[PDB]
Amino acid sequence: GVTGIAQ
Amino acid sequence: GVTGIAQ
Amino acid sequence: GVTGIAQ
Amino acid sequence: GVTGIAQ
Amino acid sequence: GVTGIAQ
Amino acid sequence: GVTGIAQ
Amino acid sequence: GVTGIAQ
Amino acid sequence: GVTGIAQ
Amino acid sequence: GVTGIAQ
Amino acid sequence: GVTGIAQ
Q1: Which in C2, E3, H3, I3 has the greatest CB count within 10 A?
Q2: Which family, according to the similarity comment (chains A, B, C, D, E, F, G, H, I, J)?
């Protein structure tokens, strides 16, 4: 899958 | 799946 | 599935 | 999968 | 997979 | 604050 | 703050 | 802050 | 801060 | 800061 944190 | 936090 | 928090 | 943190 | 931290 | 996704 | 994804 | 992805 | 990916 | 990827 695709897992992300964008800050 | 696709899991994300965007801040 | 698709799971997200957008802030 | 693809896993990332972008700051 | 692809794993990254970009700062 | 505190922001989380737990799966 | 504290930001997390736990899978 | 503290930012994490745990898989 | 503290930033991590644990797999 | 402290930045890490653990696999």
Answers
A1: H3
A2: Belongs to the Cu-Zn superoxide dismutase family.
Q: Which amino acid is at D6?
A: A
Rg (CA), chain C: 7
Quick one: tokens of J7? 């696999």
By C-alpha distance, the chain E residue nearest I3 is E5
What amino acid is encoded at H7 in this protein? Q
CA dist., res. A5 & res. G7, Å (int) = 13
Measure C5 CA to nearest chain F CA, in Å: 8
Give the strand order in the sheet containing B2-6: C2-6, B2-6, A2-6, D2-6, E2-6
Q: Name the residue in chain I with its Cα closest to that of D3.
A: I5
Method: X-ray
